Amino acid sequence: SSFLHIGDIASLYAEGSTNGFISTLGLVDDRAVVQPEAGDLNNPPKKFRDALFKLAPMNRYSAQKQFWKASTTDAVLLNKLHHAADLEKKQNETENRKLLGTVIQYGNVIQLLHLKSNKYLTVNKRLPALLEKNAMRVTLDEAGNEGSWFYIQPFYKLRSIGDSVVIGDKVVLNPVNAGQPLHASSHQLVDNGANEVNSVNANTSWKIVLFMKWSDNKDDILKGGDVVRLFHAEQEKFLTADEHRKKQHVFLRTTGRQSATSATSSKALWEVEVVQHDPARWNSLFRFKHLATGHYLAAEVMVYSLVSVPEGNDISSIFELDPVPRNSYVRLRHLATNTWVHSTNIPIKEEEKPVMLKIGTSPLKEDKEAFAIVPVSPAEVRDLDFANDASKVLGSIAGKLEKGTITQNERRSVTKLLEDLVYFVTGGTNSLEVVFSKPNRERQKLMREQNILKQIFKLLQAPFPFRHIARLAYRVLRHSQQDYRKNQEYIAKQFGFMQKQI
Ligand SMILES: O=P(O)(O)O[C@@H]1[C@H](O)[C@H](O)[C@@H](OP(=O)(O)O)[C@H](OP(=O)(O)O)[C@H]1O
Secondary structure (H helix, E strand, O other): OOEOEOOOEEEEEEEOOOEEEEEEOOOOOOOEEEOOOOOOOOOOOOOOOOOOEEEEOOOOOOHHHHHOOOOOOOOHHHHHHHHHHHHHHHHHHHHHHHOOOOEOEOOOEEEEEEOOOOOEEEEEOOOOOOOOOOOEEEEEEOOOOHHHOEEEEEOOOOOOOOOEOEOOOEEEEEEOOOOOOEEEEEEEOOOOOOEEEEEOOOOOOEEEEEEEOOOOOOOOOOOOOOEEEEEEOOOOOEEEEEEEOOEEEEEEEOOOOOOOHHHOOHHHEEEEEEOOOOOOOOOOOEEEEEOOOOOEEEEOOOOOEEEEEOOOOOOOOEEEEEOOOOOOEEEEEEOOOOEEEEEEEEEOOOOOOOOEEEEEEEOOOOOOOOEEEEEOOHHHHHHHHHHHHHHHHHHHHHHHOOOOOOOHHHHHHHHHHHHHHHHHHOOOOOOOOOOOOOOOHHHHHHHHHOOHHHHHHHHHOOOOOOOOEOEOHHHHHHHHOOOOHHHHHHHHHHHHHHHHHO
């Protein structure tokens, strides 16, 4: 019939006493859950981009595990030991590419890679779980290890070991050595209607719901869920979505640089929706979800004009393309109205020499009004993500301590976070006993444009114990303004509202 393969991207739907898709709480918190009322089979989850896993072959963790004994006075042995762990780490890559597309058989030993987080689902053999007492702590480690090996074995005996894994099949994922099989909990988390998944012998069956077949040539083809910017040919501007006069507007943004492709911005990024029937994987139609906010793109009331819509369902949010390949230069057409996108010069307004030029549409098909489908790096997408996290972590904490007390569990994570931010913004140099400390521009223009910095200030403040909070945030500030003349101006203005207490 139809089988599962190495490379297929699927979701895993629990079918025990608790049901749900496995998912993360983000790129800050390394825990795995089934949010049961978030989505079923019939009604798929809202942020279903987070319940997607790739099926990976068995990874090699021998020389890499050796190297994780940094028990040594000697340096050359350490450089010896690492060189292996890097050779091995690349030997995996070589081989896993060969095993691409091969049918998984029951009782092979695959790893399950989380797409959105890019971490490996992992049993930690020598731990308790956090919410459940007996069960082992299943986490998401980045590089993986021996406890990320899983025997994929059949739940009901309708099929058996050796037999090829068909789509939909209920399986038990069982760790190779790490002990007990994966199990979706009966315990809701303290903070989130979210059940903690862990490793303990229980009668949970995992439904394998295929999303995208192992045929997604990239970066080679535009397919659903790619993140791209839409640059303008003639106007030389990126399609952007932000607010003006408290109103969300879609526009081409005016730049003041000597390079048009350099004007890169997070608010310019869009997720692709290669429209399907069942929620799954050049002749059919597309919807553009604004990677920052979550709202989609549509043209309503030139007969029409492009603006954001809060939900991507209405037949307005759907577009068509005209000359699919990566980095294509297309002319896009609005379906429900049959019109060709067009850019204007009347901007939005109160500003002196503004930047937000309005975009509408026209029944006349042009030639110059072409948009470049500039592919965004997957890493950059995760930077928006690992930063959006920081905004909502401090979103709760700076709200929680602004009107009372926080728990002893919260300090330990925000202090952790404010350490992670230091490790991020300097492109993984700084952190403690340092050696060097040199900044990163992407993350800077991201500390700001995603309001990490806005949070920091609305955190320090207790208006009308800290030895590792303030001025820890101020060391983060100290980093994010480095040689950055625009961020300097921002932190100077933000410090203007900060002193306003007196
Ligand atoms: O180097 P400076 O003079 O301090 O200012 C930077 C740059 O020269 C532009 O003014 C601006 O890009 P735009 O022209 O596109 O606004 C940019 O913002 P960005 O780096 O956040 O894009 C600033 O950081």
